[PDB]
């Protein structure tokens, strides 16, 4: 689909049987999800942005379906204000920016 | 042009006759530039990021050229990791996300 940016580009994601809403962020290197329990071991990481850094747990090779398409990648989970789909998974679905 | 997301989507912007690099960021409502001298009065604006809220100075009617595309709008200036072109200007140059 071709999404315009008059509004926040929000889509529904299916992650570990849960249906969620997330932001397609081309300004995010990585996908950061709001706090939740994901299986598998994790590693602490710090990610920054506007307002500074938050500590997140990094999980590798998580499967997410973005708008029906499947993608595997790193998924950070932390005190993020919104679920964010970053570049790491956007590439996976064939996302591009055009103008 | 069509921009892939394998690497940060960095573009050259021309502002005040100066060239700068800025990220095309669909997860940003607004355009935030690192500290710079802009013309006119600014008004106060609070924005939220991954780390929390910060205060920025808001300038209206700033002409910016993004890849030779002329845009005229609101530009925010404050402590940002990098210059970010938000959906306010992205919609002005006709940017869409496609997949």
């Amino acid at each position: 689909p071709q999404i315009t940016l008059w509004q926040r580009p929000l889509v529904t994601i299916k992650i570990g049987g849960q249906l969620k809403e997330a932001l397609l962020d081309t300004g995010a290197d990585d996908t950061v999800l709001e706090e939740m329990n994901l299986p598998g071991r994790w590693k602490p990481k710090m990610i920054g942005g506007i307002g500074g850094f938050i500590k997140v747990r990094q999980y590798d090779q998580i499967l997410i379906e973005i708008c029906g398409h499947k993608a595997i990648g790193t998924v950070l989970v932390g005190p993020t204000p919104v679920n964010i789909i970053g570049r790491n998974l956007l590439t996976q679905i064939g996302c591009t920016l055009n103008f | 042009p069509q921009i892939t997301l394998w690497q940060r989507p960095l573009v050259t912007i021309k502002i005040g006759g100066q060239l700068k690099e800025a990220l095309l960021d669909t997860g940003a409502d607004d355009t935030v530039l690192e500290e710079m001298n802009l013309p006119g009065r600014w008004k106060p604006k609070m924005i939220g990021g991954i780390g929390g809220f910060i205060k920025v100075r808001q300038y209206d009617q700033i002409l910016i050229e993004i890849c030779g595309h002329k845009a005229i709008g609101t530009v925010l200036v404050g402590p940002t990791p990098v210059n970010i072109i938000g959906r306010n200007l992205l919609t002005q140059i006709g940017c869409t996300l496609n997949f």
Partner: peptide
């Protein structure tokens, strides 16, 4: 890094 509301 991640990007503003």
């Amino acid at each position: 890094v991640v990007x503003a509301x």
